[PDB]
DNA sequence: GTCGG
DNA sequence: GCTGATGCGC
DNA sequence: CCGACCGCGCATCAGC
């Protein structure tokens with residue numbers, strides 16, 4: 001929070017480019033700058049000082065000076081005043097409503113939470129659940145609650161098949177004292193890159209979690225990825241906990257390290273690392289790390305036995321999970 | 327919007 | 332039904 | 342300049 005003002009501004013600018021302008025590269029340009037500045041161990045004094053960091057160019061440097069001088073940005077002041085931009089930004093806050101759907105709804109006169117509710121008919125399944133738990137999904141999850149949730153998930157999974165291995169990733173694995181949701185990596189020995197020896201591997205876990213009323217809703221569900229809603233159980237007479245977003249990713253057992261690297265993040269860390277990988281002539285996804293031939297085509301998966309092995313291939317000193325929060 | 331070649 | 336492009340989210 | 346910007350699972354659609 002050393003340069004909170006500045007990083008907030010860049011984040012607001014990032015969200016505007018993404019939601020309203022549908023300018024994804026500008027979105028990331030601002031996010032990166034916000035990321036690099038949030039990490040800077042000095043209270044920024046000028047745009048020039050900021051322009052020294054990678055990701056901060058002339059435009060952002062200029063904005064930082066305006067912000068430091070006045071304590072605000074005129075460009076953002078006007079963006080806030082604009083009713084169309086405001087409505088669009090708001091609607092994208094509902095899970096399932098992106099920049100396109102948001103702009104479309106606004107074109108129909110649907111601009112508020114009140115409008116969305118009275119128009120459920122115009123929403124697909126995901127958007128309907130996003131609206132249902134709109135308030136809840138805005139809440140942070142204390143680590144203490146993440147710990148209780150982890151205990152339920154691992155124990156329920158164990159009951160389905162002792163050979164299952166569920167690992168909580170995301171910011172939780174990064175040591176955060178609060179998380180925006182729960183990310184669960186799942187593996188089973190019967191599912192590898194070589195073959196699937198048993199079907200419904202993900203389904204059974206989902207099924208079991210619904211049986212005990214932990215999983216309450218489903219946003220989307222496939223053979224290897226579940227996106228849904230869960231809730232901790234509350235005691236007698238006590239207010240029940242808010243509903244939480246939960247994602248479960250089933251990855252081939254022999255590709256765990258690439259999988260846990262991916263799911264631990266952060267997203268920007270993944271983007272930076274995968275970009276660096278490319279520079280070093282490699283390509284990384286949640287399954288493997290492969291070399292890039294002269295042509296530019298991915299070769300065969302390289303051997304991996306730890307997260308560190310991935311970092312070594314691209315000549316990066318190993319970074320613990322707690323230091324990947326970019 | 328920023329960067330490297 | 333399929334394939335592929337697009338939206339959306341991780 | 343100017344091209345590059347990470348990589349992919351699921352839901353949905355158009356075109357066949």
Ligand SMILES: Nc1nc2c(ncn2[C@H]2C[C@H](O)[C@@H](COP(=O)(O)OP(=O)(O)[C@@](F)(Cl)P(=O)(O)O)O2)c(=O)[nH]1
Pocket residue numbers: 169170171172178179180181182183262263264265266267270271341347348
């Ligand atoms: N490669 C890649 N990985 C991504 C991307 N987005 C997410 N991931 C990976 C890396 C992410 O760590 C992981 C989980 O996605 P979240 O839950 O959205 O991210 P988080 O858990 O870190 C969080 F801090 Cl935003 P919290 O949920 O606590 O508020 O998915 C992306 O664009 N690209």
Ligand SMILES: [Cl-]
Pocket residue numbers: 022023024025026027
């Ligand atoms: Cl763009």
Ligand SMILES: [Cl-]
Pocket residue numbers: 254255256257258259287288304305
């Ligand atoms: Cl691996």
Ligand SMILES: [Cl-]
Pocket residue numbers: 285287288
């Ligand atoms: Cl792969």
Ligand SMILES: [Mg+2]
Pocket residue numbers: 170171179180181182183
């Ligand atoms: Mg998360």
Ligand code: NA
Pocket residue numbers: 050051052053054055056057
């Ligand atoms: Na710079």
Ligand code: NA
Pocket residue numbers: 091092093094095096097098
């Ligand atoms: Na959204």
Ligand code: NA
Pocket residue numbers: 170181182183246247341
């Ligand atoms: Na998540």
